[PDB]
Amino acid sequence: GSMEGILDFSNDLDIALLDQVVSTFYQGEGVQQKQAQEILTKFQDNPDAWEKVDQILQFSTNPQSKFIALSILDKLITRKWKLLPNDHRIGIRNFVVGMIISMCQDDEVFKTQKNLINKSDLTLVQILKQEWPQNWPEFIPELIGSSSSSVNVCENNMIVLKLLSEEVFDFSAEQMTQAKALHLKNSMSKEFEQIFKLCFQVLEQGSSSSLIVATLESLLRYLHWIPYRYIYETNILELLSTKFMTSPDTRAITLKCLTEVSNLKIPQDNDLIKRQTVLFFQNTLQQIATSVMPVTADLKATYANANGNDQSFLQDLAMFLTTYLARNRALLESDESLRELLLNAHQYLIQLSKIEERELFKTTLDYWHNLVADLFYEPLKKHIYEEICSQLRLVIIENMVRPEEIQLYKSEREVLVYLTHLNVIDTEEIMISKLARQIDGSEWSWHNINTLSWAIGSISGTMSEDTEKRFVVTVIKDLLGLCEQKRGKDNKAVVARDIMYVVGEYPRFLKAHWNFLRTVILKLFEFMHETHEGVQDMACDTFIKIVQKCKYHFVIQQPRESEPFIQTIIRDIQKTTADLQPQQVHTFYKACGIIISEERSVAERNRLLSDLMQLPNMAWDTIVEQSTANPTLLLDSETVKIIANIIKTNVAVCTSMGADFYPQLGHIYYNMLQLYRAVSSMISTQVAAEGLIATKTPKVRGLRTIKKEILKLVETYISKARNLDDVVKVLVEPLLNAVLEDYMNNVPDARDAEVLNCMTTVVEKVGHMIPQGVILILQSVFECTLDMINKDFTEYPEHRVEFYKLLKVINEKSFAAFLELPPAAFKLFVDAICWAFKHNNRDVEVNGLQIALDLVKNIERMGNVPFANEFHKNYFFIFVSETFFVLTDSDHKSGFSKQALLLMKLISLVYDNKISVPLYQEAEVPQGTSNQVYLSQYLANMLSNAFPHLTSEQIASFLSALTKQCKDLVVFKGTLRDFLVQIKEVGGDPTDYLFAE
Amino acid sequence: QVQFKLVLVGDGGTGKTTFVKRHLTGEFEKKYVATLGVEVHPLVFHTNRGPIKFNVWDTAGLEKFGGLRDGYYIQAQCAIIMFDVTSRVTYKNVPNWHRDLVRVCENIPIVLCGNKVDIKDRKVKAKSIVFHRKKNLQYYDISAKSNYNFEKPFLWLARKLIGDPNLEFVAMPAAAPPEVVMDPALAAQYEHDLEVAQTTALPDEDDDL
Amino acid sequence: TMEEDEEVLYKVRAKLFRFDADAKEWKERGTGDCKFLKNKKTNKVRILMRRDKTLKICANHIIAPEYTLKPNVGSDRSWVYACTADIAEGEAEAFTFAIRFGSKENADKFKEEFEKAQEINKK
Ligand SMILES: Cc1ccc(C)c(N2CCN(c3ccc(C(=O)O)cc3NC(=O)c3ccc(Cl)cc3)CC2)c1
Ligand SMILES: Nc1nc2c(ncn2[C@@H]2O[C@H](COP(=O)(O)OP(=O)(O)OP(=O)(O)O)[C@@H](O)[C@H]2O)c(=O)[nH]1
Ligand SMILES: [Br-]
Ligand SMILES: [Cl-]
Ligand SMILES: [Mg+2]
Ligand code: NA
């Protein structure tokens, strides 16, 4: 098309053509917009495009064109600036300053082209970062001088100073060397006295609200770093807290300023400063009460109505009050004349806490947590806040969330527990009266009865046992009445759920009162027959939650009972669980396993485990008979579901019983590993007949589920096993025989990554006791898994993760298995580690770097022997260059800390002389030469080729600092980050690598 | 029509394109194809106050595919900043994206979105996410994959841009669909395309739906 | 909404996919309430499916007598069928659809109701 003409640089630039392309991009649609976009991208990315910038700024009438031109300039200033001759740098500086002053002097352009002026200012600030103050000592005096000549220039100068302060103090850590950041911070600090005088004058002299707002915007940035005396020893505190709070144009920015004032570093022992800290708060809240809204205002309604900037203002007020009071409320607590101020400030927070806005509620909730924790421990404070705490109890109860929202529920519970300790009678009265409002129907709703139930549950354990007993009885009585009142099982189920919820949160009551606990369990068994949605789920969740807390009461013979209640539960288990879904039956069996683990007499525990497992074991025995008689019976989808649900029931009981589960695992183990083999045959058979698509069929996913649940059962047992001698003598050999060859001899798409996970647990727990087993695991899984995952970063994501977890534990527990690899296979191990480094999947990358670290430590342990010397000769420079690759390429930032640690370990090995042989091959360097001198040479050469725009001086200074700092990780990391800044630009100062705090 | 420019910014691989695509077509793209510069797509919601259209500028998060960078933000009326709750670095870069965005767009509604909350191993914990507070950003936990809160960013922005706190998404009108006809000429053609579709497996066969 | 003139014969939660030729892959179109709507003027039964939360239309077509619910190789709880005229995205298009349900029972109930709706549409 015609637009592509701007990309042809052999011709002079048609500005009118550029303006059309830019208009087509910003204002056009679909196909035309997409083409302009690609064209503008290639124009901008042309390394000579910056030469056209002066032409475009002078002769373009499209503000978007000039904006894109300034981006092209910014790319030059931040990256290649130091290549330019000094005369051209002053040229560019002068045309940018000229365009800014020119746009500020024209009222129409100043008003309507704010985008281009702010971009121009940011462009100037990039020049200041390069040139100032060493090649521009008069910048700040001239800016101040130029400020008295015009309101527009003064306002725009406040934008430049704000952006300069952001670039030097807020955003420098990342983007500059430590030495350059220190230089610019000291430079701004040295000239600040002048900057502040101008800012203070504008604030006193007033008039233009747009100038005043921009000055306060720059002040907000200054408050991140300036010393307290500029705030406390001038009239500025009075101005911010009186004049600038009254007008609404300045109020938003002023409140943010006063929040940062509240965070200044300040002397602790000075009564005048204390009075000044009190006074500005007093002034601010007075201006709020008289100019914005009284303490009584309904901020919930105001925020919901969302007129103008009210939402931002109420957020900022919450931020100001919480920040100030968290630091300073003790200044208001002793003086009786400051009591009204302290409670007004808290009453505003109470009103802000009623606003329906999650994130605002969280901000206020963090303050209430701070306050009520202080009232719990600090003497003579609770009585000050009695009426604040009473209102807060209602606010927290009315806002309680389900325990599923873990962080928010945790915070709410903690505040409500502290408040209950401070006044238990007030907490009880509010909860009982909110319950009365559910019963009379005035506040009745599913959300309201759920919220109240969550609140009543959250405070379990805070009352004395007696108070708790009377309260819990009153609440259950009231909810029972409420349940009976209501019509339709929708409503009855909601109240039944909440009864179940509350009872499950009060275990101390249940443990003291056996008859009640028995009735509750029997009632949960009744509800396991209710198909109304949510009820069976809740009956099962409540059963296991009560068992976790009260299990001892199920395992003893309670007086006036024939037997321990666990025997009663087991006897009736067929009848109890008949209407439950499989996953609910598994929770039920898990819960029984928790009870049975309480029985420490071996014979009685084994008998209970036997009785519990009767129904699955009889289903299992009947299936093994048929299945062994005829392998065809297993093809039936119904038989496959029964088998999976037996294995899953075993997994569920083994989860809760761990080491105690062994006799049950013993009953099924050998037939279970024969079933694993038979199922493997059927999957192989089906993929042969149907192709890879077979792996997606319900039949094959059903068979694979049996394999995965078997590996899960064995992994679950071995992870918790106590008798490791039986694991090695009875479990491991048959397990390896059933799973390893089947994994190796399946096509990639039929291999189960769960095999790798199971083997990881085996090596973790008993790796030291099965050295020949670890060798066999590696021979089976290593090359075939590596070939699945070494073509791209995406295929076989589960195999990828479990593979590097398995190499990690083998490298920790049975490093000898890697010594028994032939050299070619040990080379694939090094390749695999380096492959992990290059991953963006953070699980893989992190394991990759840890294996590399542990591998070096394993080699160091061997001391001075052939294998260790051959490791260094063959692989030292591979690890050094691979670690440098991922440090420097900008695509692996998440692993920075472990890349640094690995690189430090490698540099430290040579700097200490802990490597015994020359790292260089014969006749490549004088034969006497130390590894330290060759490492210097190899790295300088490698960095020079990879970063040819760096000087020899930059590279040699970097390597000098790096090797000196290779026992000091935090300083070494700083040197690495300094290097990552300098590779992004030309002409980085080599003295930066000498940086010392 | 009533239209608003929305810029979507954040680190590479956080879910910007996946989130937008889910809203445009309903699909979940599992593959990561890095955006080159910007992808522009119109997106219409039906509200109780009539249709609202977002001109969605879905920008590149990778520095090497950044294209015009802050040139994409010019005349944006609203924005989403996206990070990945499974990747700490992506939350660390939120202040960098916010900085570049507000220098161009000084007074606009902005949603901060922590994507991928469907993933079991969350690395950016609730307690750490406070950047939005002092910057007056709305914050949502989302998942483009589970659809957790996936309407919330656009519902919030629409309430801010229309200036109606009670604005709701409503059911778009559903016309009576036409009659079947069917062509003997395309009969054999239909069998072919149905054969391939029946023998390609539906994705995510372990999901609740 | 344009649903006031219709009775609901069947409602079930489902996920809907469309086959793309270009990429040999299924693409989700929506998840939500799938409804069989009988027009009280014509006695014509359509499928109407809306997305959760946005309530945008992901399926809008007559349950044609000539359509056949086929198994998908990967699922015991899905149907695939060619649709000649779906108006969800606006202009009548042919699609190969797959619809998946929570359970085998919901899939089998869906098929029973879909054949019942085919018989109503034949009259
Ligand atoms: C409808 C329904 C739903 C769920 C449950 C657990 C129940 N329950 C029915 C059995 N329950 C009681 C029935 C009668 C009576 C009585 O005062 O005579 C008492 C209870 N239970 C209690 O008072 C009680 C109180 C507190 C606790 Cl933690 C456990 C039990 C309370 C538990 C009822
Ligand atoms: N688990 C999970 N993965 C997600 C989710 N959203 C997106 N992804 C995946 O994240 C990857 C990257 O998604 P993209 O949308 O391409 O990321 P992006 O932010 O647009 O990337 P750039 O264009 O490079 O900035 C893809 O593999 C998505 O499938 C989510 O909610 N959950
Ligand atoms: Br904060
Ligand atoms: Cl006890
Ligand atoms: Mg993208
Ligand atoms: Na209700």
Swiss-Prot record, chain B:
Domain of life the protein comes from: Eukaryota
UniProt keywords, alphabetically: Acetylation, Cell cycle, Cell division, Cytoplasm, GTP-binding, Host-virus interaction, Hydrolase, Isopeptide bond, Magnesium, Metal-binding, Mitosis, Nucleotide-binding, Nucleus, Phosphoprotein, Protein transport, Transport, Ubl conjugation
Recorded consequence of changing Y32A: Loss of one hydrogen bond with the gamma phosphate group of bound GTP
Phenotypic consequence of R69E: Probable loss of interaction with NUTF2. Loss of transport to the nucleus
Stretches the record annotates as Interaction with RANBP1: 204-209
NCBIfam families: small_GTP
Name the record gives this protein: GTP-binding nuclear protein Ran
